[PDB]
Design a protein around this ligand. Structure first.
Ligand SMILES: Nc1ncnc2c1ncn2[C@@H]1O[C@H](CO)[C@@H](O)[C@H]1O
Ligand SMILES: [Cl-]
Ligand code: NA
Length: 316
């Protein structure tokens, strides 16, 4: 078996985000539980990526996972320079370069699940004004923002959407103040797509009580605020990391040198309802799932950047 092997994991910021980074740790710990492999987990930061990952290498890791686009260039450099080490990255963002054979990149079509979140929030909102709180801007987050705004307009052409960015995935207090300002300005539902920062958005909703709703992200976040999180736009990082790593442990060769793309139809993303609010939002949830099937069948082409969004809006 694979018991002698080691799989390592490096994230940016804290593991304990109730979402994206946490899901990567869940996968690695489940691999340890099921296969009895060795694991190493490291929470890192930009000023020390190079040293932290060089250390996972020196621990003779058989596979090193990096999580999130902020690790893109470092994971690429280390893979390029260490041909005998295998690396995989969740959401590497690369422009010019060709991916080396010992690096596997995973890309999620986040705009697809964000479209479901926007459609849902737009149908559910009583004020007709909804919010989006993002983490760090860039290609990944813009896919969430434009997918959300497009799905919202698809549900109601005159929907009002307020978008703000915390600017980091690790500022809970700024998530809270951003959300508090939105709720005070007539927003009644906020999609928090902001890592740990978004948990502060949830805190703001809890502090304001009933009628301040959240669309959660990455994992089912209804348990964080069972009266306020209506639905969650999940990203199935843990399932994918487990299955890809298990295959790698069986073959010993990384299926790398490429980017694997996952959206709704690959079961890489999904929309998960809070059962405590079922009687009240089930009809909208079911309509949202039909929208998801239209996306999966290629009927709705979901925008993901400014150009595709502006075209989508003009062609509605
Ligand atoms: N530490 C992080 N680093 C990079 N991207 C992140 C991080 N946390 C969250 N994200 C991204 O923001 C989205 C919403 O939390 C996630 O699905 C992921 O794409
Ligand atoms: Cl605070
Ligand atoms: Na804080």
């Amino acid at each position: 078996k694979s018991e002698a092997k080691t799989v390592s994991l490096i994230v940016d910021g804290a593991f304990d985000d109730k979402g994206f980074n946490e899901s990567s740790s869940k996968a690695i710990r489940k691999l340890k539980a099921d296969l009895n492999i060795n694991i190493i987990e490291k929470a890192s930061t930009g000023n020390s990526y190079l040293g932290d990952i060089a250390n996972l290498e020196d621990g003779n890791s058989n596979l090193i996972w990096g999580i999130g686009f902020r690790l893109s260039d470092i994971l690429f450099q280390r893979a390029s320079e260490n041909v005998s080490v295998n690396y995989a990255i969740i959401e590497g963002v690369y422009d010019e370069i060709q991916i080396p054979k010992n690096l596997l990149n995973i890309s999620f079509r986040s705009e697809e699940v964000a479209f479901l979140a926007g459609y849902f929030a737009s149908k559910a909102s009583k004020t007709g004004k909804i919010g989006f709180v993002g983490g760090v801007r860039g290609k990944v987050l813009e896919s969430f923002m434009y997918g959300y705004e497009a799905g919202a307009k698809y549900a109601n052409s005159n929907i009002k959407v307020v978008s703000q960015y915390v600017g980091t995935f690790g500022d809970f207090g700024l998530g809270r103040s951003t959300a508090s300002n939105m709720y005070r300005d007539g927003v009644d539902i906020i999609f928090a797509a902001a890592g740990l920062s978004g948990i502060g958005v949830i805190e703001a909703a809890k502090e304001l009580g009933p009628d301040h709703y959240i669309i959660g992200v990455d994992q089912d976040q209804s348990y964080l605020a069972p009266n306020n999180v209506i639905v969650s736009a999940v990203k199935k990082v843990d399932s994918l990391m487990y299955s890809l790593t298990k295959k790698y442990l069986e073959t010993g060769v990384l299926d790398g040198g490429k980017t694997m793309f996952l959206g709704l139809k690959e079961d890489g993303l999904g929309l998960v309802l809070n059962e405590n609010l079922k009687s009240n939002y089930s009809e909208i949830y079911n309509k949202s799932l039909k929208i998801g099937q239209s996306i999966m069948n290629g009927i709705i082409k979901v925008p993901y950047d400014k150009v595709s969004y502006d075209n989508f809006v003009l062609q509605m």
